[PDB]
C-alpha cells in the first residue's frame with residue numbers, strides 16, 4: 001500500500017521533454033504510477049474538483065513557463081502540498097516567476113533569471129567553455145540513507161540555477177550542496193556585489209518535510225534528469241582527473257523519486273496502552289508515586305507492507321510544563337514499553353513521544 | 368434504499384381516501400433478497416380486471432452534501 | 444545571418460541509417476524500402492543475387508502493390524530482370540484511371556517505369572490530375588509529384604508542379620528552425636525526395652527557398668531514431684537527393700575539436716561536408732573577417748583558408764591574440780550549388796595568471812606600531828602564526844598580472860576563504876582591486892562578528908582565483924590566521940534528530 005496514490009500529473013513546457021527524459025518516465029511508470037502528460041500552459045489543467053484532489057502527485061518539468069494554465073496557481077499548489085500531495089519541481093536558467101515564488105513559500109530561494117552556477121575548478125571536460133557544467137562530488141551529498149539510497153554513487157552532473165536555503169525555516173533539507181569553490185552569479189557580469197550563493201551555501205537539490213508530512217523536492221537543473229546526463233560519461237576538465245564510464249545521475253534520481261512519493265521512510269503509530277502495574281485497565285486517576293507501565297507500537301512501511309519498526313532511539317517523556325522524566329523505550333515483544341514511578345508532585349501530566357529523525361516521518365503522540 | 372425507508376403507505380385511487388387505505392404487513396418471500404410487503408386488496412381481483420393503487424414511500428438521509436465542507440459565502 | 448543547418452547525418456548517423464535499411468526482408472514492401480533506400484545512399488546489398496530471387500518468388504502478377512515494389516527493388520538491384528506477362532501490362536494500365544486513387548496511379552506508373560513497359564504518359568497525367576482534384580491531401584500530392592517524375596516530359600507536368608507552392612505554404616513551422624507537414628517525419632522526407640527528383644527530371648530548379656530547405660532538412664533530421672523500415676527508406680532518399688543534386692547542395696561547416704583552449708595550438712581547422720558528412724573537397728574556404736568581442740573591431744580580414752586534407756586550416760601565428768573571445772566569419776566558395784555557404788563561429792583565447800608580490804601583514808588597530816609585513820610568494824606558504832584579535836588587525840595585499848604579457852588582470856573570481864580547522868566552517872570574502880589594481884583585504888574582528896558569528900578559533904586562509912579564460916585557476920593556502928573575538932557575554936536546534944539527555948526525578952527523602 002502506497003501512502004500516496006499512483007495518480008500523477010506531469011506538466012511539461014514542451015512535449016519534446018518526454019522523449020528527452022524517456023528513461024526517467026519509464027522507470028517511474030514501471031513502479032505502477034499512472035502518469036498523465038499535459039502542457040503546462042494548457043487551459044484545461046485543474047487540481048481540485050468539488051474539494052477533492054484529482055491527482056496525488058505533481059511533477060512540474062516546466063522551467064520556462066511564465067504562467068500556469070487553467071486554475072493552477074501558486075496558492076493552489078500550496079493548498080495541494082498542505083493536503084499531503086508530493087510535488088517535484090525542476091528549474092533552469094530560464095526560470096519564470098511562478099517557480100521562484102513557489103520556492104519562496106517553501107523557504108527555498110531561487111537565484112535571479114539568467115544566472116548559473118559557476119565552478120572553475122571542477123567543471124567537466126565536455127563543458128562548452130563557460131565552466132557552468134559542474135561535476136558534483138558525492139561528498140557534498142547529504143548523509144541520509146533513506147533519502148539518497150544506501151548504495152554509493154558516482155559523480156553526478158548538474159547544470160542549472162543555484163538556490164539558497166532560508167536559515168529561519170528548520171524543515172529545509174540541504175540534500176546536495178555545491179563545491180567550496182562554487183558560487184551563483186551572472187557569468188558575463190563581473191562580481192561587484194556579494195554572490196547570492198557562495199561556497200557550500202549554494203544548493204543544487206533541496207527537500208522539504210512539511211508538518212503534515214508532505215514532501216517537495218526542488219532541483220536546480222532540469223537537465224539532471226535528462227537521458228543525456230544519465231548515459232554520458234564524466235571526466236573533470238582539470239588534469240589528473242579519472243574518467244568514469246557512467247554518471248551517478250540515474251541512480252540518484254531513482255532514490256529521490258522514491259522518497260518524494262512516500263515509498264521510503266514512512267512510519268505509523270498504533271495503539272498506546274497505559275495502566276497500573278498488575279492491572280489490565282487504566283485507572284481514572286493515578287496516585288502520587290504510583291508505578292505505571294506505558295506501551296506503544298510503531299510500524300514502518302517496507303515494500304508496501306507494514307512491519308514492526310526497528311528504531312531503537314525512541315524516548316518517552318512525562319511532562320507537566322517541563323519534562324520531569326525522560327527515558328528510552330525498550331523494544332520488547334514487538335512493542336516499545338517502559339515501567340517507571342510517577343513523580344511526587346500532582347498535576348495534569350501528559351505522556352509524550354516525539355520520535356523525529358532525519359528522512360523519516362515525524363511521529364508525535366500525546367495522552 | 369430498504370434500510371432508509373422511514374414509512375410506507377398504500378391507498379386505493381378513489382374519492383374515499385380515508386377508507387381506501389390498505390392494510391400492509393411486512394412479509395418475506397422465500398428465495399428473494401430484500402424487504403417485501405403484502406397488501407390486502409379491498410375486493411378480490413378476478414382474471415382480466417385491473418385496479419389503480421397509489422404507493423407512497425419516504426426515505427431519510429438519502430441526500431448527501433457534496434462538497435462536504437463550505438464557507439459562509441458558499442452555497443449548499 | 445543565414446540559418447546554419449542544425450541537424451544532419453553525421454558519419455555515425457549515415458552508418459546507422461544504412462544498418463536500419465539493412466534488415467531481413469519480410470514482405471515485398473520491406474524489400475523495396477531496404478533495397479531502394481540503400482541504393483539512394485549509395486550502399487549495396489551483400490546478397491543482391493539472393494535479393495533478386497526473393498523478389499521473383501514473392502512477386503504476384505495480379506496485385507498492383509507487388510508489381511510496384513518488385514519493379515523498384517529490381518531496378519535498384521543490378522541486372523535483376525524479372526519476367527512480366529502481358530496480363531500484368533494490362534493490369535498496370537488499367538490501374539491508371541479516374542476511378543482509382545492517386546496512390547494507385549503512382550504504383551502503376553512506377554511499376555511500368557521500373558519494368559520498362561510502354562506507358563501513355565499524357566493519358567497517365569490526365570487521370571492523375573482528375574483524381575488529384577478530389578485527392579487534395581498532402582500524401583496524395585507528394586505521390587503525384589513522384590508520378591510526374593516517372594511520366595514523360597511531354598506530359599503537361601506544370602499542373603502537378605503547381606501543387607509544390609501550395610504544399611510549401613501548407614507546411615507547419617516551429618519558428619525559424621524547422622519546417623514539416625502535420626503528418627510527421629515520413630511525409631517530409633518523401634516530399635523532399637519527390638520535389639528534388641521531379642524537379643531534376645523536369646529540368647527546372649526547385650521553387651523552394653534555400654532557407655526553407657534548410658529548415659525542412661532540420662525537421663527531417665530532428666529525430667535520429669527511425670523505428671520502421673518505411674521511415675528509414677524515406678529519410679535515406681531525402682538525404683541522398685540533398686547530398687547530390689543539380690541545384691542546391693547543403694554546406695555543413697563545424698569546427699573540429701574544442702576551440703575553447705585554442706591558445707595552446709593557435710590553429711583553427713573547420714570541417715566542410717555535405718548532409719551525408721562527405722567532405723566538400725572541391726570547395727575553397729576563406730576567413731572573411733575576425734572581430735574582437737570586447738570592442739567589435741576587426742583584427743584580420745580577407746585571409747584565405749588552405750585545404751589540408753578534408754579540413755580547412757588557417758594559421759594565425761603572426762597575430763598575438765589577447766585574452767578574450769573573438770568571432771570568426773567564414774565563407775565557403777566554389778560550386779554555385781552550395782547553400783548556407785556562410786557560417787559564423789566563435790573562438791576563445793585563454794591565458795594564464797601569475798600572482799606575485801603578495802605581502803601578508805598584521806597591523807595594530809590603533810596604528811601606534813608600524814605595520815609588520817611578511818613577504819610571501821605563491822605557492823610558498825607563509826611561515827608562522829599571525830594574530831587577528833581585539834588589538835591587532837590582519838590584512839592581505841596581492842597583485843595579479845598575466846605571466847606571458849605582464850598586463851594587469853582582474854579575474855572574475857577572487858575570494859579569500861577562512862576555514863575553521865576544528866569545526867570545518869568556511870567563510871568566503873570577495874576581494875576587490877584598488878585604483879592601482881593591487882588587491883587589498885582587511886579583517887576587523889569587532890565589525891566582522893556578524894560574518895563569523897563571533898566564532899573564535901584557528902582558520903586556514905585560502906586564495907581562490909579563477910576565470911573562464913584562465914587556463915590555471917589557483918586555490919592556494921596562503922597562511923594560517925587565528926581570530927580571537929571578544930569573549931561572549933553568554934544552538935540545540937541543530938540536534939533535530941538525537942537522543943536528549945536522560946532526566947530523573949528526585950523523590951523527597953523520608954523524615
Ligand SMILES: *[C@@H]1O[C@H](CO)[C@@H](O[C@@H]2O[C@H](CO)[C@@H](O[C@@H]3O[C@H](CO[C@H]4O[C@H](CO[C@H]5O[C@H](CO)[C@@H](O)[C@H](O)[C@@H]5O)[C@@H](O)[C@H](O)[C@@H]4O)[C@@H](O)[C@H](O[C@H]4O[C@H](CO)[C@@H](O)[C@H](O)[C@@H]4O[C@H]4O[C@H](CO)[C@@H](O)[C@H](O)[C@@H]4O[C@H]4O[C@H](CO)[C@@H](O)[C@H](O)[C@@H]4O)[C@@H]3O)[C@H](O)[C@H]2NC(C)=O)[C@H](O)[C@H]1NC(C)=O
Pocket residue numbers: 321322323324935946947948949
Ligand atoms: C504557580 O505557577 C507558576 C507558573 O508556572 C509555577 O512556576 C513554575 O514552577 C516550576 C517548578 O519549579 C518551574 O520549573 C522549574 O524551574 C527551575 C528554574 O528555572 C531554571 O531553568 C533555566 C533553564 O533555562 C533554559 O533551559 C533549557 C536550555 O536548553 C531550555 O529548554 C529551557 O526552556 C530554558 O530556556 C535555568 O537556566 C535557570 O537556572 C532557571 O532558574 C528549573 O531549574 C527546573 O528545572 C528542573 O526541573 C524540571 C522539572 O520541573 C526539569 O525539566 C529540569 O531538567 C530540572 O530538573 C532538575 O531539577 C529538578 C528540581 O529543580 C529536579 O527535581 C530534577 O530531578 C533535576 O535535578 C537536576 O537539577 C537539580 C538542580 O536543578 C540538581 O540538584 C540535580 O542533581 C539534577 O542535576 C524547572 O524547570 C517553572 O519555571 C515555573 N514557571 C514560572 C513561569 O515561574 C509555580 O510553581 C506555581 N506555584 C505553585 C505554588 O503551585
